[PDB]
Specification:
2 copies of one chain form a homodimer.
Chain A: H1 2-17, H2 22-25, E1 28-36, E2 39-41, H3 43-56, E3 61-70, E4 73-83, E5 97-109, E6 112-121, H4 123-128
Parallel strand pairs in A: 1-6
Antiparallel strand pairs in A: 1-2, 3-4, 4-5, 5-6
Chain lengths: 133, 157
Amino acid sequence: SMAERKALCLEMVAAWNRWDLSGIIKHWSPDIVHYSEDNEVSSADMVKLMEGGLKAFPDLQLEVKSIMAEEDRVALRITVTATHQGEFMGVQPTGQRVSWHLVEELRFVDGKVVEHWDVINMRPLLVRLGKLP
Amino acid sequence: SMAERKALCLEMVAAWNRWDLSGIIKHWSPDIVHYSEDNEVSSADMVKLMEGGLKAFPDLQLEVKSIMAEEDRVALRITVTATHQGEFMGVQPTGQRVSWHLVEELRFVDGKVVEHWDVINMRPLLVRLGKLPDVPKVVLEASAKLAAALEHHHHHH
């Protein structure tokens, strides 16, 4: 049900908040497809980005601002806050607090995520890292 | 109903796509609140951004990639495509094709929008406007391989 799929998504959020990547990935279908900016991203590459992001921002926390479900999909509007602790986009760590915003959309089959779409706004982070004014 | 609220949201998309800002704002409650990056944005400022955006990208088109509704809310994942014909963020128009991606979330009361939240990914546009470097995927891949190799050296004994 929508209620159950929402609960599973909030468990994936909890996994992020424990810095437990396996607790997210365990819900993926082996046939999962990831999309970002209307282009497919391989699972191998997605895991690299997850591991890399966790390394750069080891204390990151997700706040779910809104959650919505319809049919076999769930969408979460999330604010991330962290400290910049490891090299990210070529910028050496500074210990400064950073934040960004995203919406993750997931589609489920048989309790497993088969499609995952993200829209990520890193404008505030790019500003803090000196990439934008 | 959810179906009706989705239909109203798609009318707002249609208004964008015929470049008619009045056809969007007519669905706003007088008491509407807009949020972006967890901060409120005044309706005055929102309309100015809409007007300025339309001037810079006069042929813009919204493609609805997904639409979802629950309770009194609707969310749309949208890809925008346009040509850069007017000055934007201090960058003179190139005539280049550009794109960006966003999610809009709307809450309705009595058929009018009372709350509006956006999450906008302008990364691809920022690259096109020269605000961020334009780096090929293969070069990003090579940089990632290098960074991994350097990290590996640092834990090798």
